[PDB]
């Protein structure tokens, strides 16, 4: 799978509380995390479906 | 708010919660039809909740009003965070009382050392997470621009101001964005960004409201 899928969820510097999905490699599935609102990294999706499609692997 | 305290019930009547399913940002009521928040708190649909203390319990003093107009500053940069300010026009004028009140805009820019009150329902932990039911408060000073710049090398513009402590321990955090920084009864800052929360040498960065009084007044009068 892509390298960014293996990186820990990145909240970023902004201070909003935006619920996003990230791929948890250890768990083998996408989970939610708190995104701050700006400068998002790639392991950040608006849906579990988009997250698994991109980072679920094969 | 990390390292703060629970605000006395409705002691911050200008504080509002921005909600789009769940609380995601704060804001400040500046007149019976307008709220000012951070531009990065933009969402196509926003419900403004006023008169809140416990955001997870219907207390009996709340007013729920939808955002009719959402106007971000025309020069907002989503990467540098310069001009991180946004105006929200309410679908209907709110009823002003002891629990729902307006906060005055700055008469001029407050100097470094001015003590202020920061508030919000953001994370209360620097490590891990704890979303508080009750509104949190924090008394903190506007820091010298030189210290702000030293803490955030090359990232601070004239439209930003650091508020907090260089030693860390107390700061605003995720869920506080768009919220108020009030000094001597005037809204001098808006919770914007920072590296982590309550970390030493990284106090929170806030939108310097005194640079936008005219933009706010002109925008309200035109909409
Ligand atoms: Ca409530």
Shape of chain B: globular
Estimate the helix proportion of chain A, in percent.
Answer: 10-25%
CATH architecture of chain A: Irregular
CATH superfamily of the largest domain in chain B: Trypsin-like serine proteases
Q: Major sheet of chain A: order of its strands?
A: 1-2
Largest interface: A-B, 13 and 28 residues
Task: Give the H and E element order of chain B.
Answer: EEEEEEEEEHEEEEH
Number of domains of chain B: 2
Structural class of chain B: mainly beta
CATH topology of the largest domain in chain B: Thrombin, subunit H
Question: Would you tell me which CATH topology of chain A applies?
Answer: Factor Xa Inhibitor
**Count of helix runs of chain B:** 2
CATH class of the largest domain in chain B: Mainly Beta
**CATH architecture grouping of the largest domain in chain B:** Beta Barrel
PDB class: hydrolase/hydrolase inhibitor
Keywords: Digestion, Protease, Secreted, Serine protease, Zymogen, Protease inhibitor
Assembly: dimeric
Entry title: Anionic trypsin in complex with bovine pancreatic trypsin inhibitor (BPTI) determined to the 1.49 A resolution limit
Task: Describe this structure as you would to a colleague.
The complex is a heterodimer of chains A (about 60) and B (about 220). Chain A has about 60 residues and is of the alpha+beta class. In chain A, about 15% of the residues lie in helices and about 25% in strands. Chain A has a two-stranded antiparallel ribbon with strand order 1-2. In chain A, a hairpin with a 4-residue loop joins β1 (about 20-25) and β2 (about 30-35). The longest helix of chain A has 8 residues, at about 50-55. Chain B is mainly beta. Chain B is about 10% helix and about 30% strand. Chain B contains two helices and 13 strands; from the N terminus they run βββββββββαββββα. In chain B, the strands form two sheets. A seven-stranded antiparallel β-sheet of chain B has the order 1-9-8-11-12-13-10. Chain B has a six-stranded antiparallel barrel with strand order 2-3-4-7-6-5. The chains are: A alpha+beta (about 60), B mainly beta (about 220). At the A-B interface, loops of A face β3 and β12 of B. Bound molecules: calcium ion. Calcium ion binds near residues 52 and 59 of chain B. The PDB classes it as hydrolase/hydrolase inhibitor.
